[PDB]
């Protein structure tokens, strides 16, 4: 689909049977999810947002369905005011910016 | 143009005759540039994202050219970790996400 930017580009995601909403974010290197229990091992990672660095948990090889497209990759879990789908998964679903 | 996301979508912008690099950022409501002097009235503003709050200066009705596409709108200036073109200006240049 084509998604305009008049409002926040928020779409429905499905992860582990959890139905959620997430922001498609070209300014995000990584995918960052609100607190949820994900399976398998994790390790800390420090990532930077507008207000500086925060510590998050990094889980690898997590499948996520984004607007009906299958993705699988690294998902970070931590203090965020929104679920954010970053470029690591946007590339997987063939997302581009067009103007 | 069409811009893919395997690297950060960094583009050159022109503002006040000055050339800068900035990130095309669908996850940003606002446009935020590193410290610089811009003309006229400005208002202190607080903005929020991952890592918390940041104090910036708001300048309105500022001409800015993004990849040769003209915009005139609000530019926030402050200690941002990255120069960011947000939706306020992405919409002015007709940007969309496509997949
Ligand atoms: C290399 O670092 C990154 O890629 N950092 C990403 C990041 O923070 N990206 C920022 C832009 C950025 C890039 C590099 C360094 C610092 C910042 C944005 O793409 C996402 N971000 C994170 C974000 C996104 C959405 C929201 C939000 C808030 C209220 C309701 C819904 N969503 C909050 C934070 N947005 C904002 O912080 C914006 N905030 C905003 O639009 O607030 C409404 C600003 C910018 C205008 C301040 C993540 C931590 C998500 C990976």
Burial class (CB within 10 angstroms; exposed 0-12, middle 13-18, buried 19+) of A8: middle
Interface residue B71 vs chain A (CB under 8 A): no
Closest CA to A8 of A19, B39, A21: A21
Cα separation, A76 vs B34, in Å, equals 27
Cα separation, A14 vs A31, in Å, equals 14
Written as six digits, the tokens of A87 are 């470029």
Written as six digits, the tokens of A2 are 């084509």
Q: Are A92 and A73 in contact (CB under 8 A)?
A: yes
Residue with the two structure tokens 């996520």: A64
Cα separation, B33 vs A23, in Å, equals 22
User: Method of determination?
Assistant: X-ray
3-class state of residue A87 by DSSP: helix
Interface residue A68 vs chain B (CB under 8 A): no
> β-strand B18-24 against B10-15: which pairing, if any?
antiparallel
Resolution to 1 decimal place, in Å: 1.6
Length of chain B: 99
Burial class (CB within 10 angstroms; exposed 0-12, middle 13-18, buried 19+) of B90: buried
Q: What is the DSSP letter of B90?
A: H
Cα separation, B13 vs A23, in Å, equals 25
Q: Which residue, among B50, B76, B87, B94, would best test binding to A if mutated, counting the most A CBs under 10 Å from its CB?
A: B50
Ramachandran class of B33: left when φ > 0, alpha when ψ lies in -120 to 50, beta otherwise: beta
Query: In A1-99, where does DSSP find H-type helix?
Result: 87-90
Q: What DSSP element (H or E) covers B33?
A: strand B32-33
Q: Are B25 and B81 in contact (CB under 8 A)?
A: no
Print the domain residue range for A90.
Answer: 1-99
Closest CA to A50 of A84, A27, A22, A77: A27
Closest CA to A75 of A65, A90, A66, A64: A64
CATH number, residue A31 = 2.40.70.10
Overall domain count for chain A:
1
Q: Measuring from atom 2 of ligand 1, which residue has the nearest CA? A: A48
Ramachandran class of A67: left when φ > 0, alpha when ψ lies in -120 to 50, beta otherwise: left
Q: Which residue, among B1, B21, B26, would best test binding to A if mutated, counting the most A CBs under 10 Å from its CB?
A: B26
């Amino acid at each position: 689909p084509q998604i305009t930017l008049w409002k926040r580009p928020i779409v429905t995601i499905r992860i582990g049977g959890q139905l959620k909403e997430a922001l498609l974010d070209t300014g995000a290197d990584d995918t960052v999810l609100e607190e949820m229990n994900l399976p398998g091992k994790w390790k800390p990672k420090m990532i930077v947002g507008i207000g500086g660095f925060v510590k998050v948990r990094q889980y690898d090889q997590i499948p996520i369905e984004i607007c009906g497209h299958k993705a699988i990759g690294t998902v970070l879990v931590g203090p965020t005011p929104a679920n954010i789908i970053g470029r690591n998964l946007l590339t997987q679903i063939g997302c581009t910016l067009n103007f």
